[PDB]
């Protein structure tokens, strides 16, 4: 039961947060000192019953408070969950109400604890890269199949120096929600700033959204000195912030 050192509620919030029944956000972090490979923010509009997913690029060039501009991924390295939460709140200028961190092991247990997740594979390029990544232990086929954790894991790690990987992560995560609604878990290696009891209460809601939507931060390669960063498009960032603050109903 993690507790951000930032207190009872996000410092980004002006009014008092209802535990509770009003709009909120969740940061998912997957690791695998150390760096986060999965970086997905979800905002949940209560009144609308809608959700918005955003993957923060591993290499996004952002200010890490107390550390200067750097790759987004290093935040969790320099300061763990709390530093990363700060970085996201500073960068997106929204409250991050909940965070859940996990290694990809816990991830794999979840998937076939659910008896696999539905995923429609479409690309031979992808089938091949996984084939090679895994030295043939994992071999996907085209079309709609139910993957087990090993297969889902491999799908979610595959990577050509940027992200589309984030797109695969959001794809499987929404698949997990879907597969979960047709029935702790646990629920074991998840570290959250949430109690399981509280978590359980959010499930009904999370599990009956009227729609899910992905958003995307666009940008460009910035390689000052053979060090790779993804420079964010500032106009797109501002738009995204404005859309996020709305869902949350802040500002």
- Do 53 and 42 meet the contact criterion of CB atoms below 8 Å apart? yes
List 192's β-bridge partners, or say none. 100
CA-based nearest residue to 162, from 69, 237, 228, 75 = 228
CA-CA distance, 244 to 144, in Å (whole number)?
32
CB of 125 to Cl ion, least distance (A): 8
Closer CB to Cl ion, residue 115 or residue 120?
120
Among 2, 31, 121, 177, binds Cl ion (CB under 5 A): 121
125 binds Cl ion (CB under 5 A): no
Closer CB to Cl ion, residue 71 or residue 157?
157
- The stretch among 57-65, 86-94, 117-125, 211-219 that binds Cl ion (CB under 5 A) is 117-125
- Residues in binding contact with Cl ion, number by CB under 5 A: 4
123 binds Cl ion (CB under 5 A): yes
177 binds Cl ion (CB under 5 A): no
126 binds Cl ion (CB under 5 A): yes
Closer CB to Cl ion, residue 71 or residue 165?
165
145 binds Cl ion (CB under 5 A): no
CB of 122 to Cl ion, least distance (A): 4
Q: What is the secondary structure of 158-222 as a DSSP string? A: ------SHHHHHHHHHHHHHHHHH-------S-EESS-HHHHHHHHHHHTS-SEEEEE---EEEE
CB of 38 to Cl ion, least distance (A): 18
Residue 18 falls in which region: left (phi positive, over 0), alpha (psi -120 to 50) or beta: beta
- Do 74 and 35 meet the contact criterion of CB atoms below 8 Å apart? yes
Closer CB to Cl ion, residue 116 or residue 201?
116
CA-CA distance, 15 to 147, in Å (whole number)?
43
CB of 166 to Cl ion, least distance (A): 14
Closer CB to Cl ion, residue 154 or residue 248?
154
122 binds Cl ion (CB under 5 A): yes
Cis before 209? omega within 30:
no
- Within 13 Å of residue 228, how many CA atoms lie on the same side as its CB? 8
List 115's β-bridge partners, or say none. none
Closer CB to Cl ion, residue 46 or residue 118?
118
CA-CA distance, 111 to 107, in Å (whole number)?
7
- The stretch among 25-33, 83-91, 116-124, 205-213 that binds Cl ion (CB under 5 A) is 116-124
Residue nearest to Cl ion (CB): 123
Closer CB to Cl ion, residue 82 or residue 133?
133
Give the interface with Cl ion as residue ranges (CB under 5 A).
121-123, 126
């Amino acid at each position: 039961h993690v507790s951000l050192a930032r207190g009872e509620q996000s410092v980004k919030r002006i009014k008092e947060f209802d535990p509770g029944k009003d709009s909120f956000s969740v940061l998912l972090l997957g690791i695998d000192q150390a760096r986060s490979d999965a970086n997905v923010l979800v905002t949940f509009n209560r009144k609308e019953k809608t959700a918005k997913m955003l993957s923060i690029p591993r290499d996004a060039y952002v200010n890490i408070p107390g550390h200067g501009y750097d790759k987004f991924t290093h935040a969790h390295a320099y300061g763990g969950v709390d530093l990363t939460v700060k970085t996201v709140e500073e960068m997106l200028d929204i409250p991050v109400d909940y965070v859940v961190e996990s290694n990809f092991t816990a991830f794999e247990d979840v998937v076939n604890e659910l008896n696999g997740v539905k995923v429609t594979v479409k690309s031979d390029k992808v089938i091949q890269q996984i084939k090679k990544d895994t030295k043939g232990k994992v071999v996907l086929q085209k079309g709609t199949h139910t993957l087990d954790g090993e297969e889902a894991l491999a799908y979610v790690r595959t990577r050509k120096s940027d992200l589309l990987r984030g797109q695969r992560q959001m794809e499987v995560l929404s698949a997990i929600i879907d597969k979960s609604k047709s029935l702790d878990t646990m629920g074991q290696n998840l570290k959250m700033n949430l109690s399981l009891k509280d978590a359980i209460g959010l499930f009904p809601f999370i599990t009956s959204l009227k729609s899910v939507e992905s958003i995307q931060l666009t940008g460009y390669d910035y390689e000052p000195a053979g060090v790779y960063y993804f420079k964010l498009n500032q106009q797109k960032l501002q738009e995204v912030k404005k859309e996020l603050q709305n869902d949350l109903g802040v500002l």
